[PDB]
């Protein structure tokens, strides 16, 4: 969550943490078992067969 | 509590932590996907929280 990416907290190591520069991408198979808060959020691209 | 390793307060106390003054807004995002399905009820520690 970019609320979250500018202030990650790793509870280990307990510091904050600026995750804007790191960019990530997810991926996935089905678009059902993927959690609610980690669907609308995040941009569906849709490769096809 | 304090003897478990995983020593989380929660995550309210968490905001309070980052947050650091005593009257902020939280947004407690999608209270309707709350289920008692043998991992605890939250909802009925969201019942002290609200």
Redesign the interface.
């Known amino acids: 969550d970019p609320e979250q990416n500018h202030?990650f907290?790793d509870?280990y190591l307990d510091v904050?943490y600026d995750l804007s520069k790191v960019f990530f991408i997810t991926t996935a198979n089905t678009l059902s078992t993927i959690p609610?808060?980690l669907l609308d959020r995040m941009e569906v691209i849709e490769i096809p067969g | 509590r304090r003897t478990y390793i995983g020593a989380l307060p929660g995550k309210i106390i968490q905001g309070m932590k980052q947050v650091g003054v005593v009257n902020p807004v939280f947004l407690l995002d999608e209270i309707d996907k709350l289920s008692s399905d043998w991992r605890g009820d939250p909802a009925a520690a969201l019942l002290e929280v609200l």
């Open positions: 202030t907290t509870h904050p609610r808060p």
